[PDB]
């Protein structure tokens, strides 16, 4: 249980400095841990930036630096870039094995904010004819890349037979994602209202349909 | 315990 921890998510703009930190559960993160920082960009592309607490991996831009702050290891990115939007991973060496953190999902506001473009599709009769119903809610063109999807049947929150995908980057760099609600054709025939609630940057959007 | 030499198979 020697666990390593990091900031879930942080936000910054192009040009600003941002710092990510890394906790050791045993205690102070020291040099004997050889802090390693790794970047993961969209579609599993990993690249190590800093190794051994502060050694910059060759070929890495100079705006990346590492150190220790307090009893934590830190990753300093100065002059924040748009491509720098990615999730950053921390790795510590505890004598005979490595241990990563959960990763910090960093957001570099390189474009305007745009609320989600939601579309609610009702169940197709073809699928209905097999005694099963599925509501599909496509969510495109939103930025930043985080939304919270909520389904509601007859105005009441449902939380069963629901699947939401993790936001995925679009062509134009904005984020898209889908959610689904599956029920039996039967169950679908007793209710009247169905709605896909999407919450983005504190603003909530809904799309409803009445069977 | 490692980080070299004494350990091939562990």
């Amino acid at each position: 249980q020697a666990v390593v921890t990091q900031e879930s998510a942080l936000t910054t703009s192009p040009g600003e400095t941002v710092t990510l930190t890394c906790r050791s559960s045993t205690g102070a993160v020291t040099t004997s841990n050889y802090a390693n920082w790794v970047q993961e960009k969209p579609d599993h592309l990993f690249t190590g930036l800093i190794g051994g607490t502060n050694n910059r991996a060759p070929g890495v831009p100079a705006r990346f630096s590492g150190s220790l702050i307090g009893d934590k290891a830190a990753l300093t990115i100065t002059g924040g870039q748009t491509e720098d939007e990615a999730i950053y991973f921390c790795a510590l060496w505890y004598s005979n094995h490595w241990v990563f953190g959960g990763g910090t999902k960093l957001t570099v506001l390189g474009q305007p904010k745009s609320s989600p473009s939601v579309t609610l599709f009702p169940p197709s009769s073809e699928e209905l004819a097999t005694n099963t119903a599925t509501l599909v809610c496509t969510i495109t063109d939103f930025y930043p890349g985080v939304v919270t999807v909520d389904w509601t049947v007859d105005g009441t929150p449902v939380t069963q037979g629901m699947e939401t995908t993790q936001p995925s980057k679009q062509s134009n760099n904005k984020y898209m994602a889908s959610s689904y609600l599956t029920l039996t054709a039967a169950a679908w025939e007793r209710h009247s209202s169905y709605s896909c609630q999407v919450t983005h940057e504190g603003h909530t959007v809904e799309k409803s349909l009445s069977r | 315990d490692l980080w070299t030499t004494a350990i091939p198979t562990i």
Partner: protein, 215 residues
């Protein structure tokens, strides 16, 4: 151009054993340590171990020593990882990461993949249903429900359509996938001209072309 090529994905039945690969090119293979990392969404990353290409010198994460065997073939410059007696828990992406020693310590280069799926589920063709509205002008769609195992190919109007199309990643309920692809068009083309998605599931040797109709 330092490179670490890895097979995109491999499907295997629970109880079997796979041998993943990591071909190296660009640098002197035997002067860099190689590592293997395991990732499962929700969990983050786990260090499996490392092999020293020059010595064959090996070092494991105790939690992976009776499950993984690292090795390399110097002439071909590739690194291998044999996983044994496969279970559900071993379904994941397995990375190979090149490691730098002295001057300092670096985890510079990473191969890009190999998501391993360990399932005892039989192939299943998808079911395609047209998603039409009830009621950039109008959005349509295709639901590709219950197919196994990945991937699937969705195209719209055999390529005639480039914009608006948004194929989403698959969800996995009841050990069975599902995804959907969307395409938005000028209220003119619809219902005037018509859109048709082209779902294709290679494993099940199936190809369904569905035209979206009024509702």
């Amino acid at each position: 151009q330092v490179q670490l090529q890895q097979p995109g994905a491999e499907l295997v039945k629970p109880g079997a054993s796979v041998k993943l690969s990591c071909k190296a090119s660009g640098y002197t293979f035997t002067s860099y340590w190689m590592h293997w990392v395991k990732q499962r969404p929700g969990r983050g990353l786990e260090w499996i171990g490392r092999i020293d290409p020059n010595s064959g010198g090996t070092a494991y994460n105790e939690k992976f020593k009776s499950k993984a065997t690292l090795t390399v073939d110097k002439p071909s410059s590739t690194a291998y990882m044999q996983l044994s007696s496969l279970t559900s828990e071993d379904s994941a992406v397995y990375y190979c990461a090149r490691y730098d020693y002295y001057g300092g310590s670096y985890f510079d280069y990473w191969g890009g993949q190999t998501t391993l799926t360990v399932s005892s589920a039989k192939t299943t063709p998808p079911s395609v249903y047209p998603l039409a509205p009830g009621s950039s002008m109008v959005t349509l769609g295709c639901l590709v429900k219950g197919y196994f195992p990945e991937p699937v190919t969705v195209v719209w109007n055999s390529g005639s359509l480039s914009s608006g199309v948004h194929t989403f990643p698959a969800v996995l309920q009841q050990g069975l996938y599902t995804l959907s692809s969307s395409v938005t068009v000028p209220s003119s083309p619809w219902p005037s001209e018509t859109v048709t998605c082209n779902v294709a599931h290679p494993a099940s040797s199936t190809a369904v072309d569905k035209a979206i109709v009024p509702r």
